[PDB]
C-alpha cells in the first residue's frame with residue numbers, strides 16, 4: 001500500500017476498525033442472552049432480555065452498511081478528516097442507542113433509526129465532492145490560455 | 149482524491165449514494181409502522197402492516213451488501229459504466245419489490261430474492277475482468293518479435 | 298483499472314466474489330423453506346426447518362459486513378495474501394456454521410458468533426499496517 005495514500009485513509013480505517021470492534025461487542029451481548037437459557041440450538045426468542053438485545057443488535061446491523069457507505073464516500077469524495085470524525089460520533093450514538101435499547105420497561109429507544117443527522121451530513125460531503133468534481137471537470141478544464 | 153480517479157468511480161458513487169438514500173427510505177416506512185402500532189419499545193412483531201414492512205425492509209438489508217459487492221467489483225474490475233447502470237436498475241427492482249411487499253398482499257409478491265439477474269450479471273463483469281486480467285498478466289506481455297534473429 | 302493495482306487486490310476480489318456467491322446460496326436455501334411452507338411475512342417463530350434456516354442465514358448476513366471490513370483493511374493495510382487466505386477460511390467456517398445450523402433434530406449449532414479468530418486475526422493485520430504506517434511516517 002502506497003504510504004502516501006494510506007495516509008489519506010488511515011482515519012476512516014481507524015474509525016472503521018473501531019466500529020468493527022464495537023460491532024463484535026453488540027454481537028457478544030447477544031451471545032450472553034442466547035446463553036442464559038435454552039439458546040442451546042440458538043432459539044431466536046429467549047425473552048425480554050434476549051429479545052431486547054437481538055433486537056437492538058439487529059437494528060445496528062442494518063445501519064452498518066448504509067453508514068459505512070457515506071463514511072467513505074464522504075471520506076474520499078471529500079475531506080478524510082470531517083468524514084472520519086462524524087463517522088466517530090456515529091460510533092457514539094450507536095453505543096448510546098444500543099445501550100438504551102437494553103430494556104427494563106419504558107420506551108427503550110423505540111427507534112429502528114438513529115443518528116439520521118450524522119449519515120445525512122456524511123451524505124452531504126459525498127454529494128458535495130461528487131458535484132464539486134463535475135465543476136473541476138468542466139469550467140475546471142476549458143480555461144484556455146491561447147498565449148500564441 | 150485524485151481528480152482523474154474520482155472520475156472513473158463517480159458513477160458507482162452516485163448509484164451508491166442513491167441506494168444509500170433509498171435505503172433510508174425503507175428504514176423510514178418501517179418507523180411509520182412501529183409508530184402507529186402504538187409500541188413502547190419495538191419488537192419485530194405486532195400487526196400485518198408493520199410485520200409486512202419490517203419484513204420487506206429486512207429482506208433488502210440482506211441484499212445491500214451482496215449487491216454492493218458486485219456493483220463495485222464489476223465497476224473496477226470492468227467498465228464503470230455498465231456496472232453503474234446495472235446497479236441503477238437494481239435500485240429500481242428494490243423499489244418495485246419493497247413496494248409490492250405489503251401493499252397488495254396478493255400471492256405473486258412474497259419472496260427473499262429480487263434481481264438475481266442483475267447481481268448475476270454484475271458478478272459476470274467482475275468475474276470478467278478478474279480473468280481477463282490474468283491474461284494481460286500472462287499473455288499481454290507476449291510478442292514473439294524477439295525471434296528477430 | 299490500472300493493471301498493476303488490480304494485481305494487488307485480485308485476491309480479495311476473488312475471495313469476495315466467492316463469498317458473494319456463497320451468500321446467494323444461503324439466500325437460496327431460505328427460498329426453499331419459504332416455498333415448501335408458504336409465507337409473506339417471516340417474522341414469527343415458524344416452521345422449524347424454515348425457522349432454522351432463516352435464522353442461520355440472518356446470522357451470516359450480520360457477519361458479512363464486519364468481516365468484509367477487516368478482509369480489506371487487513372488486505373490493503375497489510376499483505377494482500379494472508380488477508381485473502383484468512384478471508385478464504387472464513388468462507389469455510391461460514392459454510393460449516395450455516396450447515397450445522399440446519400441438520401434436523403440433531404443439536405443444530407447455537408451461537409451466531411463465529412470464526413471469532415479469523416476476523417480477530419484479519420483485524421490484527423489491519424491494526425498492524427495501520428500502526429506500522431505511523432512509523433514510516435515518523436521514522
Ligand SMILES: CC(C)(C)Sc1c(CC(C)(C)C(=O)O)n(Cc2ccc(Cl)cc2)c2ccc(OCc3ccc4ccccc4n3)cc12
Pocket residue numbers: 020021022023024025026027028061356359360363409410411412413414416417418420
Ligand atoms: C477485533 C476483535 C473484536 C478483538 S475479534 C472478535 C472478538 C474479540 C474478543 C477477543 C473475542 C473479545 O473482545 O471478546 N469478539 C468478541 C468480542 C468482540 C468485541 C467485544 Cl466488545 C466483546 C467480545 C468477536 C465476536 C465475534 C466476531 O465475529 C464476527 C461477527 C460475526 C457475526 C456478527 C453478527 C452480528 C454482529 C457482529 C458480528 N460479528 C469476532 C470477534
Ligand SMILES: CC(C)(C)Sc1c(CC(C)(C)C(=O)O)n(Cc2ccc(Cl)cc2)c2ccc(OCc3ccc4ccccc4n3)cc12
Pocket residue numbers: 059062063064066112113114115116117119120121123168169170171172173174175176209
Ligand atoms: C439523504 C439521507 C442520507 C437519506 S439523510 C436521511 C433522511 C432524510 C430526511 C427525510 C430529511 C430526514 O432525516 O428526516 N432520513 C429520513 C429519510 C431517509 C430516506 C427517506 Cl426516503 C425518507 C426519510 C434518514 C433516515 C435514516 C438515515 O440513516 C440512518 C439509518 C439507520 C439504519 C438503517 C437501516 C436500514 C436502512 C436505512 C437505515 N438508515 C438517514 C436519513
Ligand SMILES: CC(C)(C)Sc1c(CC(C)(C)C(=O)O)n(Cc2ccc(Cl)cc2)c2ccc(OCc3ccc4ccccc4n3)cc12
Pocket residue numbers: 207210211214260261262263264265267268269271317318319320321322323324325358
Ligand atoms: C450472482 C449469482 C450469485 C452467481 S446468481 C445467484 C444464485 C445462483 C443461482 C440460483 C444458481 C442462479 O442465480 O441461477 N443464487 C442462488 C444460489 C446461490 C448459490 C448456489 Cl450454489 C445456487 C443458487 C442467488 C441468490 C441471490 C442472488 O441475488 C443476490 C442476493 C439477493 C439477496 C440476498 C439476501 C441474502 C443473501 C444473499 C443475497 N443475494 C443471486 C443469485
